[PDB]
């Protein structure tokens, strides 16, 4: 009865949609062709797949997902991949010409001819839905169509539907490990649109997850498929409470009332634990106290940001497995005790705890081992102003000489739009500075 709609746009958004939809089908025991294999299921999970799948009347189940991109390369390969028979044939919208790493192309010239189709598909999906909870958007901001089309979609959705909650899993460029050269231009402009249109933002940079794989899994040769599985695991843990029995259930609306103190401050960063391979897993204790301690370790964090340089505002605990509520309270109290991790004065209580009985599910051919306990941590902190600081530094350095500007003005963008994006992030960066002061 309760379910969410997922948005996957751009090259980065689709390629992480491959991993998550692999896990959701596997977690409910759904074959890639869509037929549940029975096997005396007799409603084993019964009514639990409506969050991510809908019955077709006789047999197969179809996901509540839509795919967008202006380059048919990634869309076509999904249509010819192992999951060809799963997705709806007309829900894999494919463009004609790629945005070509340009913000203006995907927002003013070719991005306006695809939104009409996408909005129609969302409307049809919503009408079939009955207990709509919100939207989940996956996109990459350091690119053309991801930042371009994604920003256009967010503006259209906010007016058409209104108060429905939106959560964005963005991918900002790393401090030094990055692909494109003109990405600061697109990254700055996209933050302008998403600041007043989304409700929860999670930072999912690339360099931080490279360190996680090397330090934990001891993988010196990682690719994107390794990273996407880690991001997919976070999504399932975050939304597990919506579709499984739990001692303390938290739905997506118990996030904005628990993690967002002010309307302009809704940017957060995530962490996940335990992260161990199949060789070292069975020689270790993996106690609840240890998994909750490693989640707060700064190098275990999923974004390249050091929490010791800032304070804390609100934290969310999402446990799954065989955890006991008494153990969680004792472990949490030790976290508050140590002086290295310091909170903010005006927030005497800062932990929201949710407990689920479902143990983590392991994908065959993966890197993680089958464990009995896991935790997902979402933290709102003032240290996030660090990553915005360096993006501003990169923008100003290459904008003083108007480099690469003619690529933007020649597509439809006005030159004055660059100044506005600078000012709002200039305002935003000092909002975090002002809140961090003490009374």
């Amino acid at each position: 009865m309760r379910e969410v709609i997922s948005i996957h746009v751009g090259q980065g958004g689709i390629q992480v949609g491959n991993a998550c939809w692999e896990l959701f089908c596997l977690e409910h025991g759904i074959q890639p062709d869509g037929q549940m294999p029975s096997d005396r299921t007799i409603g084993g999970g019964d009514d639990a797949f409506n969050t991510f799948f809908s019955e077709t009347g006789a047999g197969k189940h179809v996901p509540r997902a839509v795919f967008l991109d202006l380059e048919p390369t990634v869309i076509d390969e999904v249509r010819t991949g192992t999951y060809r028979q799963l997705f709806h044939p007309e829900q894999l919208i494919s463009g004609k010409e790629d945005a070509a790493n340009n913000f203006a192309r995907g927002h003013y010239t070719i991005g306006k001819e695809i939104v009409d189709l996408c909005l129609d598909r969302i409307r049809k999906l919503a009408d079939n839905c009955t207990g709509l909870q919100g939207f989940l958007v996956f996109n990459s901001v350091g690119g053309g169509t991801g930042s371009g089309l994604g920003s256009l979609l967010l503006e259209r959705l906010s007016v058409d539907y209104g108060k429905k909650s939106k959560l964005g899993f963005t991918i900002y460029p790393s401090p030094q490990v990055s692909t494109a050269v003109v990405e600061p231009y697109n990254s700055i402009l996209s933050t302008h649109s998403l600041l007043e249109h989304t409700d929860v933002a999670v930072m999912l940079d690339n360099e931080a997850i490279y360190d996680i794989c090397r330090r934990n899994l001891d993988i010196e040769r990682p690719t994107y498929t390794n990273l996407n599985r880690l991001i997919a695991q976070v999504i399932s843990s975050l939304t597990a409470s919506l579709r499984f029995d739990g001692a303390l259930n938290v739905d997506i609306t118990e996030f904005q009332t628990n993690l967002v103190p002010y309307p302009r401050i809704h940017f957060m960063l995530s962490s996940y634990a335990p992260i161990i391979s199949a060789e070292k897993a069975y020689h270790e204790q993996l106690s609840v106290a240890e998994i909750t301690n490693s989640a707060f370790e700064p190098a275990n964090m999923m974004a390249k940001c050091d929490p010791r340089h800032g304070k804390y505002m609100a934290c969310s605990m999402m446990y799954r497995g065989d955890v006991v509520p008494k153990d969680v309270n004792a472990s949490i109290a030790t976290i508050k005790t140590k002086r290295t991790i310091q909170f903010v004065d005006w927030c005497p209580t800062g932990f929201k705890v949710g407990i689920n009985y479902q143990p983590p599910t392991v994908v065959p051919g993966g890197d993680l081992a089958k464990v009995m306990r896991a935790v997902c941590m979402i933290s709102n902190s003032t240290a996030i102003a660090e990553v915005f600081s360096r993006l501003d530094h990169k923008f100003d350095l290459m904008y003083a000489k108007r480099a690469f500007v003619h690529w933007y003005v020649g597509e439809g963008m006005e030159e004055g739009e660059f100044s506005e994006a600078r000012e709002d992030l200039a305002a935003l960066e000092k909002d975090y500075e002002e809140v961090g002061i003490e009374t």
């Binding site: 076509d76 790629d98 050269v181 003109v182 994107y224 350095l397």
Partner: protein, 430 residues
């Protein structure tokens, strides 16, 4: 499916195009008779990018072969893979250019250009979604340097927004085949800057140096230089035809490489290149590829890259690899060589990954770079031009075909301004 059309003019352009089509047909598994005999399904998914389909299951390339003399196209038809090209795609005169720019651009080229323009228009309107143009010619000759740039001007006037690519074999003073190169070379470079979106300069001397030092083969010929140029050209557009992790088309290269509208003269290179005697003694790892890629002696230009500073650069990795090493190696080469990269731009290297390497190879990389070391290429050409022009030598042929000294004066002034504005960034500091 975002197709590209091909145009080749002059003797050098025709030979380069023939070798390129041979390489592309071999890679896609198309026999000299035009019948598909490939191995995997991936070779046919995007074959429309380079080939048209006709009744009988045969594939014909969409290329236009143009010259003012029938000498070279007789040769391309007689040679191998000469039956692929459509007989309707050959246009020619009877006189030839004779290494005179005016003859190929004002009198004889203009008279013949209508038919080739008609053929180009028909071919362009045939495809569903045009993506751009690619040109192979030489600026040191008559019919190429003039007639090709006239066609470039016309087609750019007709199609304003499509990307245009040129592979110009600019002359070099170490190896000289003509006594009148500076005039028409300067004129063509003047005419090319206002129309071409991307230019990739090539020297015969540079490829001779590569063949002598890297391949270590005693007596190569134009066939091997043509093969190297064809390999680079094929490697440029790998992502437009094969799936990968980070797809980048022609337009994505231009945005990431062109900071200002008049700075679009690049230099290219290819890797790996090994001699026949040392093939099996080297490992296949990403560090080897980037080490050979940033080799100063591995470029396709006589100019030394380490005499200037790169503005931007691009690398197009092919084959199955780990993305982490790509980024780490780019960061390391950008850090240990911070003196050779301009400081007021951060992360001035772009990387792209394709899943399908060339046949018989595991990993291959194509490098495109935009540096300030190209200016010596124009510096020496203009130096010869003024020395030849002070005495008005060899000028009466040009002036006897409706051409005036004013055009030469304009051409030489444009070269100086381009060099100045292209080199001032080397000394400019933030």
């Amino acid at each position: 499916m975002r197709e590209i059309v091909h145009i080749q003019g002059g003797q050098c352009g025709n030979q380069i195009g023939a070798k390129f089509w041979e390489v592309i047909s071999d890679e896609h598994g198309i026999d000299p008779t035009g019948t598909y005999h490939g191995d995997s399904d991936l070779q046919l998914e995007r074959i429309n990018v380079y080939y048209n389909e006709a009744t009988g299951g045969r594939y014909v390339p969409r290329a236009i072969l143009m010259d003012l003399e029938p000498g070279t196209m007789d040769s391309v038809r007689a040679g191998p893979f000469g039956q692929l090209f459509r007989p309707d795609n050959f246009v020619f005169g009877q006189t030839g250019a004779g290494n005179n720019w005016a003859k190929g651009h004002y009198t004889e080229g203009a008279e013949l250009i209508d038919s080739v323009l008609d053929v180009v228009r028909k071919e362009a309107e045939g495809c569903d979604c045009l993506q751009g143009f690619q040109i192979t010619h030489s600026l040191g000759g008559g019919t190429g340097s003039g007639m090709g740039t006239l066609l470039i001007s016309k087609v750019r006037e007709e199609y304003p927004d499509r990307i245009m690519e040129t592979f110009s074999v600019v002359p070099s003073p170490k190896v000289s085949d003509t006594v009148v190169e500076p005039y028409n070379a300067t004129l063509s470079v003047h005419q090319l800057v206002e129309n071409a979106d991307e230019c990739m300069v090539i020297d015969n001397e540079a490829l001779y140096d590569i063949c002598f030092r890297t391949l270590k083969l005693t007596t190569p010929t134009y066939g091997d230089l043509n093969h190297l140029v064809s390999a680079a050209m094929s490697g440029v557009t790998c992502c437009l035809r094969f799936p990968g992790q980070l797809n980048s088309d022609l337009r994505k290269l231009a945005v990431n490489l062109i900071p200002f509208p008049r700075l679009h003269f690049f230099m290219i290179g290819f890797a790996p290149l090994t001699s026949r005697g040392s093939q099996q003694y080297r490992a296949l790892t990403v560090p080897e590829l980037t080490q050979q890629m940033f080799d100063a002696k591995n470029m396709m230009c006589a100019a030394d890259p380490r005499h200037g500073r790169y503005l931007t650069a691009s690398a197009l990795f092919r084959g199955r690899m780990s993305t982490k090493e790509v980024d780490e190696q780019m960061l390391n080469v950008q850090n240990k060589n911070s003196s050779y990269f301009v400081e007021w731009i951060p992360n001035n290297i772009k990387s792209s990954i394709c899943d399908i390497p060339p046949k018989g190879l595991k990993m291959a990389v194509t490098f495109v770079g935009n540096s300030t070391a190209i200016q010596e290429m124009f510096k020496r050409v203009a130096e010869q031009f003024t020395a030849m022009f002070r005495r008005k030598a060899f000028l009466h042929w040009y002036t006897g075909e409706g051409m005036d000294e004013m055009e030469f004066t304009e051409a030489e002034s444009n070269m100086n301004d381009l060099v100045s504005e292209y080199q001032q960034y080397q000394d400019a500091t933030a």
